[PDB]
Design a protein around this ligand. Structure first.
Ligand SMILES: O=CC[C@H](O)N[C@@](O)(CC(=O)O)C(=O)O
Ligand code: SF4
Length: 298
């Protein structure tokens, strides 16, 4: 029914469905590509599809449009939003730049297109340390996540100015040391894979620090993992590695923005060609330049 209807319209629209790793299992199951936001945007550049339906949040659909300006990019819900990315206002960047005019501005790929337009370079979780160590400055402005900034500071020794100072992801901030201790109590043979958006005392307990793309790449290093990220990641890992064991660190670690996406509104997205994601031409050019620079440095 709904699934066959989506496939019919996907075919008719010359569309591809890109689903983030935190998407509901039934959404991942009908997606053409599944991964993190940068992986998804880059996968779409492989084909001349006319339409992208982005099963994910606002900034990720923007990144797809930045790297695929020739595609119509749809987001099924205007309530699929990232709380962390939207804490960062342009004024935050400008104030830090005014104070430290020789410091490069680095934006985590989890950020608005508009923020990327003020960046000298973007970073992923996997390359942030290498890229920031390579930047030609001992002081770096970095946003929007203060916990990832703290991790980068510890690993590079550089002076990292987080913008905004309090920027963070509520989904990952809620993991505590109590959750680490419960994980080890219940699963003593497991290792801990921990997203760098978790708080520093939780990062310190990690066996690996990785965002979702790196969790998939490094899961080969052990056969049993407790997963410190949004709980739907556990479904993706179990599907890719059915011989291993994966446990959520907390079942109630959910991203409300990701849960705005449903099969029903993916269908309505295709039927009505909504909601079209718009990125201003000069913002996209400036954001593209920062993303391409990141690839040069990695
Ligand atoms: O930083 C990786 C980009 C990605 O699209 N978002 C994630 O960070 C998860 C998140 O949204 O916090 C990921 O690792 O999948
Ligand atoms: S999990 Fe956090 S950072 Fe990732 S999309 Fe949801 S709110 Fe944004």
């Amino acid at each position: 029914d709904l699934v066959e209807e989506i496939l019919r319209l996907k075919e008719e629209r010359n569309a591809i469905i890109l689903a983030h790793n935190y998407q509901l299992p039934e959404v991942q199951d009908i997606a053409d590509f599944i991964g993190d936001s940068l992986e998804l945007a880059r996968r779409a550049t492989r084909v001349d599809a006319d339409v992208i339906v982005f099963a994910g949040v606002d900034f990720m659909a923007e990144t797809a449009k930045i790297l695929n300006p020739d595609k119509v990019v749809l987001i099924p819900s205007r309530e699929a939003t990232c709380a962390m990315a939207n804490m960062l206002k342009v004024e935050h960047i400008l104030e830090a730049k005014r104070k430290y005019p020789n410091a490069p501005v680095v934006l985590y790929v989890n950020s608005t297109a508009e923020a990327k337009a003020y960046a000298d370079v973007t970073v992923t979780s996997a390359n942030a340390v290498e890229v920031v160590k390579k930047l030609d400055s001992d002081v770096v402005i970095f946003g929007p996540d203060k916990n990832l900034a703290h991790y980068v500071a510890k690993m590079t020794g550089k002076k990292i100015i987080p913008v905004p100072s309090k920027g963070h992801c509520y989904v990952h901030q809620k993991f505590t040391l109590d959750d680490v201790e419960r994980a080890k109590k219940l699963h003593p043979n497991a290792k801990l894979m921990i997203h760098p958006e978790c708080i520093p005392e939780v990062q310190e307990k990690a066996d690996i620090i990785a965002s979702t793309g790196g969790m998939i790449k490094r899961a080969c290093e052990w056969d049993e993992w407790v997963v410190f990220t949004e709980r739907e990641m556990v479904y993706r890992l179990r599907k890719l590695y059915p011989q291993k064991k994966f446990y959520p660190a907390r079942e109630d670690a959910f991203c409300i923005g990701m849960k705005a996406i449903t099969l029903k509104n993916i269908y309505e997205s295709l039927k009505d060609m909504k909601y079209k994601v718009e990125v201003p031409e000069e913002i996209a050019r400036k954001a593209r330049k920062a993303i391409e620079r990141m690839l040069e440095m990695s």
